Design an enzyme around this catalytic site. Structure first.
Site, PDB file in Angstrom:
ATOM      1  N   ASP A 156       0.775  -1.234   0.000  1.00 49.29           N
ATOM      2  CA  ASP A 156       0.000   0.000   0.000  1.00 49.29           C
ATOM      3  C   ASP A 156       0.814   1.295   0.000  1.00 49.29           C
ATOM      4  OD1 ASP A 156      -2.149   1.815   0.344  1.00 49.29           O
ATOM      5  OD2 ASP A 156      -2.116   1.551   2.512  1.00 49.29           O
TER       6      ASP A 156
ATOM      7  N   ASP B 198      -2.047   5.634  -5.183  1.00 51.84           N
ATOM      8  CA  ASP B 198      -2.342   4.706  -4.093  1.00 51.84           C
ATOM      9  C   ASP B 198      -2.577   3.264  -4.549  1.00 51.84           C
ATOM     10  OD1 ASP B 198      -3.206   3.566  -1.726  1.00 51.84           O
ATOM     11  OD2 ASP B 198      -4.863   4.992  -1.408  1.00 51.84           O
TER      12      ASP B 198
HETATM   13  C1  QBH Z   1      -6.153  -2.674  -4.177  1.00 45.37           C
HETATM   14  C2  QBH Z   1      -7.390  -2.992  -3.293  1.00 45.37           C
HETATM   15  C3  QBH Z   1      -7.494  -1.963  -2.138  1.00 45.37           C
HETATM   16  N1  QBH Z   1      -8.690  -2.076  -1.286  1.00 45.37           N
HETATM   17  C4  QBH Z   1      -9.585  -1.057  -1.174  1.00 45.37           C
HETATM   18  O1  QBH Z   1      -9.574   0.032  -1.724  1.00 45.37           O
HETATM   19  O2  QBH Z   1     -10.556  -1.403  -0.318  1.00 45.37           O
HETATM   20  C5  QBH Z   1     -10.416  -2.789   0.042  1.00 45.37           C
HETATM   21  C6  QBH Z   1      -9.036  -3.245  -0.483  1.00 45.37           C
HETATM   22  C7  QBH Z   1      -8.019  -3.754   0.582  1.00 45.37           C
HETATM   23  C8  QBH Z   1      -7.756  -2.800   1.770  1.00 45.37           C
HETATM   24  C9  QBH Z   1      -6.865  -1.712   1.604  1.00 45.37           C
HETATM   25  C10 QBH Z   1      -6.590  -0.813   2.666  1.00 45.37           C
HETATM   26  C11 QBH Z   1      -5.631   0.367   2.442  1.00 45.37           C
HETATM   27  C12 QBH Z   1      -6.358   1.759   2.361  1.00 45.37           C
HETATM   28  C13 QBH Z   1      -7.617   1.687   1.434  1.00 45.37           C
HETATM   29  S1  QBH Z   1      -8.509   3.231   1.386  1.00 45.37           S
HETATM   30  O3  QBH Z   1      -9.538   3.166   0.375  1.00 45.37           O
HETATM   31  O4  QBH Z   1      -8.880   3.600   2.741  1.00 45.37           O
HETATM   32  C14 QBH Z   1      -7.241   4.356   0.785  1.00 45.37           C
HETATM   33  C15 QBH Z   1      -6.021   4.320   1.755  1.00 45.37           C
HETATM   34  N2  QBH Z   1      -4.981   5.329   1.401  1.00 45.37           N
HETATM   35  C16 QBH Z   1      -5.271   6.791   1.573  1.00 45.37           C
HETATM   36  C17 QBH Z   1      -5.632   7.131   3.034  1.00 45.37           C
HETATM   37  C18 QBH Z   1      -6.942   7.565   3.360  1.00 45.37           C
HETATM   38  C19 QBH Z   1      -7.272   7.873   4.703  1.00 45.37           C
HETATM   39  C20 QBH Z   1      -6.296   7.749   5.721  1.00 45.37           C
HETATM   40  C21 QBH Z   1      -4.983   7.320   5.415  1.00 45.37           C
HETATM   41  C22 QBH Z   1      -3.913   7.187   6.521  1.00 45.37           C
HETATM   42  C23 QBH Z   1      -3.687   5.694   6.878  1.00 45.37           C
HETATM   43  C24 QBH Z   1      -2.567   7.914   6.249  1.00 45.37           C
HETATM   44  C25 QBH Z   1      -4.668   7.013   4.064  1.00 45.37           C
HETATM   45  C26 QBH Z   1      -5.391   2.897   1.900  1.00 45.37           C
HETATM   46  O5  QBH Z   1      -4.262   3.004   2.783  1.00 45.37           O
HETATM   47  C27 QBH Z   1      -7.209  -1.009   3.926  1.00 45.37           C
HETATM   48  C28 QBH Z   1      -8.104  -2.089   4.106  1.00 45.37           C
HETATM   49  C29 QBH Z   1      -8.382  -2.973   3.038  1.00 45.37           C
HETATM   50  O6  QBH Z   1      -9.286  -4.008   3.270  1.00 45.37           O
END
Ligand code: QBH
Length: 375
Positions: free
Chosen positions: A35, A218
């Site tokens: 990630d 991302d």
């Molecule tokens: C490729 C598939 C990805 N996925 C998805 O989008 O949803 C389910 C699946 C897997 C999955 C991914 C993540 C990572 C998150 C996803 S998010 O969609 O939340 C954007 C965020 N990044 C930006 C962000 C937004 C808010 C807060 C923060 C802090 C941690 C710095 C960071 C990112 O880290 C957390 C839990 C999950 O189950």
């Protein structure tokens, strides 16, 4: 020696791409989600309905408790746990072992995904967005400080596995030239979009709208997320271009999935999207072209048939633009931390459209690109 890291990733854009890692002594194997959208390294450390295995601190002789709690709220899903450190290694990565911070997840909510095959997350972004604060050094920072691994990594996400080259660029994973865009600020992997076109048609919006309130790359986000105003403009343009057929209003909301007879998907009716990114020299930019096969994420037939069904992988955002996995998939992306830039090149595992092709083209001239950045 990057050949050992080629194909070290598994998963899909829907549940996430993950790499294998080991923590503790003796080494405990776990699959970790890659990630670039967060900066915390965290793994399940307690039983969970969706977890088939987890980190057992008691079984590790190198484990060290930091006697401090931690929690992380993502756009969707969240967890909390105890901070600590332990030895970490990447089997199909650089042949090294480093002591990094690890958040032992004790409780979570809509974080773990059933059947995802991963039990942890590797936040590759910068300390600035790490929890509880920027004092918790991220995994990659520790890796770079404790070893001779160069400060950069590249990701080749293949839709339709993939590779995470740690410490370099594998020239065999892409074709054509690499085009670089500046990392605006070191927290998320923030970049600046200076223009947007749909089927060669300029959206004609104040470029600040494209980066309101920011634009990030991302790998941990599935779709291409766009600010409200941009999302509406894009959808309106995509609808007109595909007016040939009618789709449920829920489809454009990423709720309902449209289906077609196995091999009859009317790709031609769906426009290509070109995102222009700020370049490396004055008044210079470049663009990446996204094909419908990218923003139309394929899903399992909800019925008892075998027809090609997809979901609109473009959704509205209130936290700025997000270039997610569906965007990264057709490309080879180089996170050149050392030179504060992100590179894009056509991936070897690119999409195969009949009369069209995903691309990275340049150079382009664009005046006042700096005004595109939101403040
Ligand atoms: C490729 C598939 C990805 N996925 C998805 O989008 O949803 C389910 C699946 C897997 C999955 C991914 C993540 C990572 C998150 C996803 S998010 O969609 O939340 C954007 C965020 N990044 C930006 C962000 C937004 C808010 C807060 C923060 C802090 C941690 C710095 C960071 C990112 O880290 C957390 C839990 C999950 O189950």
């Amino acid at each position: 020696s990057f050949v050992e890291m080629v194909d070290n990733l598994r998963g899909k854009s829907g549940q996430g791409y993950y790499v294998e890692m080991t923590v503790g002594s003796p080494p405990q194997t776990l699959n970790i989600l890659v990630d670039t959208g967060s900066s915390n390294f965290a793994v399940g450390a307690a039983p969970h309905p969706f977890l088939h295995r987890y980190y057992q601190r008691q079984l590790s002789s190198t484990y060290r408790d930091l006697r401090k709690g931690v929690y992380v709220p993502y756009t969707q899903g969240k967890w909390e746990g105890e901070l600590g450190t332990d030895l970490v290694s990447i089997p199909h990565g650089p042949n090294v072992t480093v002591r990094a911070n690890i958040a032992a997840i004790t409780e979570s909510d809509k974080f773990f995904i059933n059947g995802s095959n991963w039990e942890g997350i590797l936040g590759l972004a910068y300390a600035e967005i790490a929890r509880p604060d920027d004092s918790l050094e991220p995994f990659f920072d520790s890796l770079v400080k404790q070893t001779h691994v160069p400060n950069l990594f590249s990701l080749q996400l293949c839709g339709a596995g993939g590779s995470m080259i740690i410490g370099g660029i594998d020239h065999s994973l892409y074709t054509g030239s690499l085009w670089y865009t500046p990392i605006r600020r070191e927290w998320y992997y923030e970049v600046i979009i200076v223009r947007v076109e749909i089927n060669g048609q300029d959206l004609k919006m104040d470029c600040k709208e494209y980066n309101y309130d920011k634009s990030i790359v991302d790998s941990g986000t599935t779709n291409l997320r766009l600010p409200k105003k941009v999302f509406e403009a894009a959808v309106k343009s995509i609808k007109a271009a595909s007016s040939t057929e009618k789709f449920p209003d829920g489809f454009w909301l990423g709720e309902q999935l449209v289906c077609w007879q196995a091999g009859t998907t009317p790709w031609n009716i769906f426009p290509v999207i070109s995102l222009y990114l700020m370049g490396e020299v004055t008044n210079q930019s470049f663009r990446i072209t996204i094909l419908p096969q990218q923003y139309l994420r394929p899903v399992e037939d909800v019925a008892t048939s075998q027809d090609d069904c997809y979901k609109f992988a473009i959704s509205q955002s209130s936290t700025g633009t997000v270039m997610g996995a569906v965007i990264m998939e057709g490309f080879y992306v180089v996170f050149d931390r050392a030179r504060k830039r992100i590179g894009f090149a056509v991936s070897a595992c690119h999409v195969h459209d009949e009369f069209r092709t995903a691309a990275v083209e340049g150079p382009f001239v664009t005046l006042d690109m700096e005004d595109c950045g939101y403040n």
